[PDB]
Structure formats: structure tokens, C-alpha cells
Amino acid sequence: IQRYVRKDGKCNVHHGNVRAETLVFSTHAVISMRDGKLCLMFRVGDLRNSHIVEASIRAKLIKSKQTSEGEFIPLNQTDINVGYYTGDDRLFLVSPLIISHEINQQSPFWEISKAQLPKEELEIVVILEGMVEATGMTCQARSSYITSEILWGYRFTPVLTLEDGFYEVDYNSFHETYETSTPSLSAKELAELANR
Amino acid sequence: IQRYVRKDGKCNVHHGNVRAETLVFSTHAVISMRDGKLCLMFRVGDLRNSHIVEASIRAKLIKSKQTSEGEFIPLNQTDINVGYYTGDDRLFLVSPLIISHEINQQSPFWEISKAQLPKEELEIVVILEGMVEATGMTCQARSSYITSEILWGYRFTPVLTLEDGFYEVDYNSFHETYETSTPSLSAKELAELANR
Amino acid sequence: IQRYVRKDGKCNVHHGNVRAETLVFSTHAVISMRDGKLCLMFRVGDLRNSHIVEASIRAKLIKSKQTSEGEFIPLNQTDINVGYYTGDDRLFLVSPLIISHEINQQSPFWEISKAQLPKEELEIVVILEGMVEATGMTCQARSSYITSEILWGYRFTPVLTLEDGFYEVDYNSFHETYETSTPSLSAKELAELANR
Amino acid sequence: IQRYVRKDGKCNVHHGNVRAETLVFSTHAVISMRDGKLCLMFRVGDLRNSHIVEASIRAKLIKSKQTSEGEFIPLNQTDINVGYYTGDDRLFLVSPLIISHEINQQSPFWEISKAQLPKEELEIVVILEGMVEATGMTCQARSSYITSEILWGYRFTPVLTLEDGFYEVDYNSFHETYETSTPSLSAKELAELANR
Ligand SMILES: [Mg+2]
């Protein structure tokens, strides 16, 4: 067992680092199962040469909508749950993380099947905020996934290995994903199938 | 489908922007139905030439009150729910947003009908906080709606259109509202009517 | 109806203000009923000549305790609820506010009667944080109430009046309290009495 | 009864203090019972010569995991509850505090017995954030506990005494722990045993 973090709070990541450069999100999001739940996931990278303090991730679904009364809200925003209720949206971001949105009854993907996904006109905006530890300054980084950038039935390739007491990141694999056996039903349909 | 936000996090809003100027709230609030719920709504504008980081909206009802014991609290404040429990009060404010307060059993408007509204001596204070992305500094903008500035049975005119790959804002329409068919009952009365 | 706050966000408080000076808490806390609930209350003042942005109030009970297993924690701290769950701990602090802690089943005062109060060895630490609007800087102000500084059966004298379109504060009354008819039972005892 | 904190907000701790130096976490975490609950605890120290404003504690369990579907997440992070839901993670850090994680059904230690603990490949990362009151700057301090640094059946030795109106800290005892009678069952097993 080789420490991620030393008792003195130094991280055993990126040997020879010195902990302006910009934060990377994965080009694609993926949907697939984790412990029996359908989840939407995307990857967020760290800053090789600074800690980000009070780092937090949020995500908005951007989607035009009509209310039952006929009000048309172009580009309507709604907050997509990525750990808000348990503090898991507060990141310890010292190597890349896969951020997971569990597609449950409160999720806007609840009723979206694999066939249905491509027909949807929607966009996920991902927003990381924090304080660059050196800089002193609050920062925000953003990205976006439209429908065609969400891969149904895929997982992220892992980036992290241990070399000589220090965890290292294959940034070559950062955006890489692979196919895995995944149902094609919506989360709602899965839940209904499961409940008889 | 034309992106709101580019993979690199630049927003496709206000072509030729450069992302001190001051934030605008709509002159009026409106009350009307959205998906079968009575909602109080107001509009908050963006800053044409800076992002606001960690932007959040709150609202206080200011209303003198007497407790059942006879204590008189002049200008008593109470927090009006505008997305606190789901993180929807954390704004991605890159074009104007309609902020919605659903008038449910916990709302101070729960028992206020259309006829009753004008007889009420109350004020809504709206408070946007965040960090101007350039400036570096925390900012706060405020406004206020007294009873006569709340329009029962109205919606906001939409401001947003797509022109040549870029979303544009008709600021001429920012404060504009229009009439829509709306019950005159209080939310409480609506709920009671609905439950038989 | 004279506005607390103008559409442009200027506050109608302290005519001739210019919105380092220090924040005042009331010398005493009081306990008495509000709408059928026993509440512990204290007063927090505003800064005559700056807004405080992202202002928030918290309070800790400081009290030595022994666990059932016999562990002695000197000066053990626990968080006293002053609006955390509804966002009412986020203050719009432009004139003095009475901050209220409702003494319910989760409160550390739940079982404390009027006779019992003076026998208790406890201290309430009150902590206001925020950003002074000019200064630029985060600030914290603190105070403290020991047992003998908590007045059972009292309310705060009101400080606020309207003079010529502007709300004014009688700072002479800031610390002043008055006696009101109040049961001497603990909140727990009151609840039990009420439930038969 | 000698005040922890004076009415003017000065703390009666470290006589002759002047309220860069670095924050200390205890070398070890301990597990033992508090009021009938198994708790994981660690100690966090204060800064002798500055207040920390808006101080907050969080903790991540770092543990490689395989999902039921066979996805391997190396160094998977999950947030360990240390007061998030009651605001008790917001510290009034003016002398050392023992931070407590109650091992309940939602805890990742729920099923970990005393014999099982040493066989686990896990790490707890503890993260204190806040604003150094003078400095002006946001700070973060970190540390870490691997399995062998968690002492099952132990409590922290108390550090705090009153000398001449001022609370003083025996920093010699800061890391010191002592053995106490503690069941060897997992929290889950304890709960099951208790429920018949
Ligand atoms: Mg901040």
C-alpha cells in the first residue's frame, strides 16, 4: 500500500512537479452501469503544477422546454446532480477524476433510452470552480457535451498507475473510452423491469 | 442544434463581446402557472463583458409581522426559496435568466390570492452575489419588488434568439411581460380544489 | 408602504450614510415564545457605512461533556441551528437583526427549564462572517453569552422607525430588552404538556 | 465558569499570543464508542498566532474499488461524513479539536470489524480549508491516515487546561492517545446484536 498523500499533506502524484495552464475535461461523456445504476459520467483533469482549493463541480442541463401551459423557455437550465447532497461535488482534485451522475427518478435522463438519446436536443455544461493555490485567484473552467458527444454503453479507460512510489497519469488515455455490455433501456424502464 | 457553450468553455452569446457595468433585474415580478404550479418569477440579466463566477441568487420577503404572542417585528425577513435545495440557485449566468419561486406550502405566498395580493404590505428583495471574473472581486447586486410591482397572471417575454451561430439578447424585451390565462385562486386554494 | 430597498439596490436606511468600524452583538440573549415555540434570540448589528456581502451567522454551544462511556470533552462544541436548513442564516444585514434559534428536539436547550438554566455551565459563541463591500476583505466578528447573560422571559426592544422616507436605528435601544409573559417549563416539558 | 470567548470576541486561549506557521493533524486516527455509537476520530490543531475564518473540515476515503459490473476504479474517492448535514464541519478552531465521524449505515467503515481493519487497503485524506485572518488568503492543509495509522479501541488524550483565566494547550499531548474498553465488532454487527 503506497500512500496517495503523505502525512505532511504532499501528494504522491506527478514526480518532479512543483505544486498559466488550463484545465481539461474529457471530450466525451459516457453512460453505463455502476453497481446496478445507470450513470452519466465525464472526466475532469487536475492542474499538473497547482493545487485547486475549495474545488467544486456542478453541471447544468441546457434544454429548450415548453410547460404544460405552453410557455416556451429557450435554453432552459436545470442543475444535474453530481454529488451536491453528500459533499461529493467537493473535489480532491490531484489526479483526473471521473464525475458520476446517477440517473435516478430526479434526473433529466430518467426516461431517455439508448435509441431515444440521439433524438434529444440537449447540452450538458460542466463547471469546475475553485481557488488556484498559488495564483490566489478564484478560477472557473467550463466545457460542454451535446447529444452526439455522449457515448451510451461506454466506460472511461483508467489513467492512473504507480511508478516508484509516485502515481503517474497517462494523459494519452485521458479522453479514451471503451465499450462495455450495457442495457439499452432507459433508467426508468430498467427500474420498472426490475420491480416485478 | 447550435451549442450554447463550446468544448473549450467559451459561450456562444453576444458576438463581439470580450468576456464598470452594472447588473439589471427586471422592473417587475410576475405570478403564473408552470407545470401546474403557481410560481413567482423575476428576470436577472448577465454582464455583457464579464463572466460572474460562483454566482448565486437569494431573495428575502420583507414584511412586518406580529407573533401570536403579540411581538411586533417591523420589516421581518424571511428567505424565499429560489433553488437552494437542488443547487438551482447557483446560476450559470451568461444570458438573462427567469428565476422561479414555486409557491408551495412553505412559501410566504401560499395563501395569497390575486384579489388579496394588492392588500398586502410586503417587499421582495433580490440579491445576486458572485465574483466578477476579471475584476477579481466579489460583487453583490440588489433590487426590490413591492406589491404593486408584482403582476398576477403574466409571463416574461423571451429575449433570446439565434443569429449566425451566436445567441443574441433583445435587451429591448428584457422587462417586457405578457398576459396569460391564470387562475385567481391562491396556491393553497388551488391545491384544496385539486384534492377532491 | 415605504420601500426598504430601492429598485436600484440602494437601501433606505441611515440617511446620510456613505455605503475601520466594528460590528456589535447585543450584550444579552433572551428566551421567549414566538408562534408557540420557545426560541433563543440575540441581536446582531449592521455596519453603518459598509454593506457586508455573503453575510452568514452561526453559533456554537460550548459545553464540557462526559459521554456515557466516560470520555470527558472539555469545552465540547456543537452547532446551534440559526437558519442553516432554510438559508435564513444568510443575512441581509442592513439594519440590526434578531437572530432566532428555535428550541426543538434537536436543540441543546430542549430540556433546559427556567430554574435549570442558571445551574448550567455553558456558553454560546456567535460568529458572523462576510465580505466588507468596500474593504474587499473577508471579516469575522464574534461574541459570547454565558448562562447569566441569557434572560429567560424577555424580548428585544425594537430599534427601527421610519423618518422621512428613511429607516433609522435607535442604537440607544440596541441592547434593551423587556419582560413578557413566558412559561417556565423547558421546551421538552411544554411539548409533552401540549400533547395530551 | 471562565469564558472561552470574551464579549468583544477575543478568545481566552494561548496567553501572550498575538491573534508563516503550519497546521498540525494528529499522527493517528482512533476508533471507539461515543454515546453508544462507534466513531472514527482525528485531531486538528489551531494556528497559535492567527484565527482561521470560514474554517471547514472534509475527509475522503481513498480506496480502489471494483463495481459489480467489473469496472476497476483505482484510488476511488468518497466523502466521509464529518458534520456536513448539521454545519458541524464548520469549525470554530481556536484550540485543538477532535473531529468525529460516526460510523453508521452510510459510512464506509460500517462493515469493518477490528480484525478486518488491518486487512483493508484504504487511506483517509483529511482536508482543512479556511481564510487565515491576517494573511488575507485562503489556505488548505492536508494529511492522511492509512490502515496502520488507525487505532481501534483508543481515545485522544485531552490537551486543554485552565491556567489563570486563560485556556492553555499541552501540545506535548496533542498526538497522544490511550486505550479504552471497546467492542471488536463492526458497527453493522453491533447494530444487529443490539436489535434483538
Ligand atoms: Mg468564498
PDB file of C-alpha atoms in Angstrom, chain B residues 40-119:
ATOM      1  CA  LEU B  40     -43.372  33.872  -8.619  1.00  0.00           C
ATOM      2  CA  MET B  41     -40.748  34.825 -11.194  1.00  0.00           C
ATOM      3  CA  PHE B  42     -38.329  37.671 -11.879  1.00  0.00           C
ATOM      4  CA  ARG B  43     -35.617  38.160 -14.503  1.00  0.00           C
ATOM      5  CA  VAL B  44     -31.900  38.625 -13.799  1.00  0.00           C
ATOM      6  CA  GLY B  45     -29.535  39.840 -16.514  1.00  0.00           C
ATOM      7  CA  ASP B  46     -25.940  38.924 -17.231  1.00  0.00           C
ATOM      8  CA  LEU B  47     -22.874  41.153 -17.604  1.00  0.00           C
ATOM      9  CA  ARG B  48     -22.271  41.656 -21.294  1.00  0.00           C
ATOM     10  CA  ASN B  49     -18.473  41.799 -20.870  1.00  0.00           C
ATOM     11  CA  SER B  50     -17.593  39.594 -17.845  1.00  0.00           C
ATOM     12  CA  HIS B  51     -18.451  36.151 -16.528  1.00  0.00           C
ATOM     13  CA  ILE B  52     -19.674  36.011 -12.949  1.00  0.00           C
ATOM     14  CA  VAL B  53     -18.090  33.066 -11.095  1.00  0.00           C
ATOM     15  CA  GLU B  54     -19.852  31.281  -8.224  1.00  0.00           C
ATOM     16  CA  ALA B  55     -22.962  33.252  -8.998  1.00  0.00           C
ATOM     17  CA  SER B  56     -25.875  32.713  -6.627  1.00  0.00           C
ATOM     18  CA  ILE B  57     -29.364  34.190  -6.248  1.00  0.00           C
ATOM     19  CA  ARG B  58     -31.319  34.568  -2.955  1.00  0.00           C
ATOM     20  CA  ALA B  59     -34.455  36.541  -2.088  1.00  0.00           C
ATOM     21  CA  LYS B  60     -35.940  37.754   1.172  1.00  0.00           C
ATOM     22  CA  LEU B  61     -39.512  38.576   1.894  1.00  0.00           C
ATOM     23  CA  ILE B  62     -39.574  41.739   3.953  1.00  0.00           C
ATOM     24  CA  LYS B  63     -42.790  42.026   5.905  1.00  0.00           C
ATOM     25  CA  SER B  64     -43.767  43.431   9.252  1.00  0.00           C
ATOM     26  CA  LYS B  65     -45.294  40.752  11.440  1.00  0.00           C
ATOM     27  CA  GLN B  66     -46.953  40.171  14.795  1.00  0.00           C
ATOM     28  CA  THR B  67     -46.412  36.824  16.520  1.00  0.00           C
ATOM     29  CA  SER B  68     -49.400  35.088  18.173  1.00  0.00           C
ATOM     30  CA  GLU B  69     -47.915  36.323  21.425  1.00  0.00           C
ATOM     31  CA  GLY B  70     -48.076  39.950  20.234  1.00  0.00           C
ATOM     32  CA  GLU B  71     -44.410  40.632  19.399  1.00  0.00           C
ATOM     33  CA  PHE B  72     -44.211  43.150  16.562  1.00  0.00           C
ATOM     34  CA  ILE B  73     -41.252  42.617  14.180  1.00  0.00           C
ATOM     35  CA  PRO B  74     -41.036  45.567  11.818  1.00  0.00           C
ATOM     36  CA  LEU B  75     -39.607  44.610   8.420  1.00  0.00           C
ATOM     37  CA  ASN B  76     -39.176  40.962   9.424  1.00  0.00           C
ATOM     38  CA  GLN B  77     -37.086  38.999   6.894  1.00  0.00           C
ATOM     39  CA  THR B  78     -37.600  35.501   5.615  1.00  0.00           C
ATOM     40  CA  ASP B  79     -35.788  33.578   2.945  1.00  0.00           C
ATOM     41  CA  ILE B  80     -37.793  32.859  -0.205  1.00  0.00           C
ATOM     42  CA  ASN B  81     -36.884  29.549  -1.841  1.00  0.00           C
ATOM     43  CA  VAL B  82     -35.311  30.103  -5.318  1.00  0.00           C
ATOM     44  CA  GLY B  83     -33.454  26.818  -5.749  1.00  0.00           C
ATOM     45  CA  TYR B  84     -31.482  26.397  -2.503  1.00  0.00           C
ATOM     46  CA  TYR B  85     -32.259  22.664  -2.036  1.00  0.00           C
ATOM     47  CA  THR B  86     -31.304  21.482  -5.535  1.00  0.00           C
ATOM     48  CA  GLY B  87     -28.396  23.884  -6.278  1.00  0.00           C
ATOM     49  CA  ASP B  88     -30.554  25.652  -8.862  1.00  0.00           C
ATOM     50  CA  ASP B  89     -29.830  28.956  -7.045  1.00  0.00           C
ATOM     51  CA  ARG B  90     -26.259  28.593  -8.399  1.00  0.00           C
ATOM     52  CA  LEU B  91     -26.561  30.361 -11.689  1.00  0.00           C
ATOM     53  CA  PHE B  92     -24.791  29.830 -14.979  1.00  0.00           C
ATOM     54  CA  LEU B  93     -25.451  33.419 -15.891  1.00  0.00           C
ATOM     55  CA  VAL B  94     -24.341  34.003 -19.475  1.00  0.00           C
ATOM     56  CA  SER B  95     -27.664  35.368 -20.751  1.00  0.00           C
ATOM     57  CA  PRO B  96     -30.704  36.618 -18.864  1.00  0.00           C
ATOM     58  CA  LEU B  97     -32.469  34.091 -16.630  1.00  0.00           C
ATOM     59  CA  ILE B  98     -36.002  33.902 -15.277  1.00  0.00           C
ATOM     60  CA  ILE B  99     -35.669  32.896 -11.620  1.00  0.00           C
ATOM     61  CA  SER B 100     -38.643  30.919 -10.307  1.00  0.00           C
ATOM     62  CA  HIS B 101     -40.053  30.575  -6.825  1.00  0.00           C
ATOM     63  CA  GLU B 102     -42.609  27.824  -6.635  1.00  0.00           C
ATOM     64  CA  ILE B 103     -45.465  28.880  -4.343  1.00  0.00           C
ATOM     65  CA  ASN B 104     -45.941  25.752  -2.250  1.00  0.00           C
ATOM     66  CA  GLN B 105     -46.942  25.109   1.356  1.00  0.00           C
ATOM     67  CA  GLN B 106     -43.635  26.553   2.655  1.00  0.00           C
ATOM     68  CA  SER B 107     -43.885  29.738   0.611  1.00  0.00           C
ATOM     69  CA  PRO B 108     -44.999  33.016   2.129  1.00  0.00           C
ATOM     70  CA  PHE B 109     -47.333  33.498  -0.876  1.00  0.00           C
ATOM     71  CA  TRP B 110     -49.143  30.244  -0.228  1.00  0.00           C
ATOM     72  CA  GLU B 111     -52.337  31.858   0.970  1.00  0.00           C
ATOM     73  CA  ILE B 112     -52.224  34.936  -1.176  1.00  0.00           C
ATOM     74  CA  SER B 113     -54.919  35.124  -3.866  1.00  0.00           C
ATOM     75  CA  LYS B 114     -54.992  37.585  -6.761  1.00  0.00           C
ATOM     76  CA  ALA B 115     -57.523  39.847  -5.030  1.00  0.00           C
ATOM     77  CA  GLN B 116     -55.574  39.589  -1.764  1.00  0.00           C
ATOM     78  CA  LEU B 117     -52.158  40.440  -3.272  1.00  0.00           C
ATOM     79  CA  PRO B 118     -52.725  44.209  -3.637  1.00  0.00           C
ATOM     80  CA  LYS B 119     -53.821  44.430   0.029  1.00  0.00           C
TER      81      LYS B 119
END
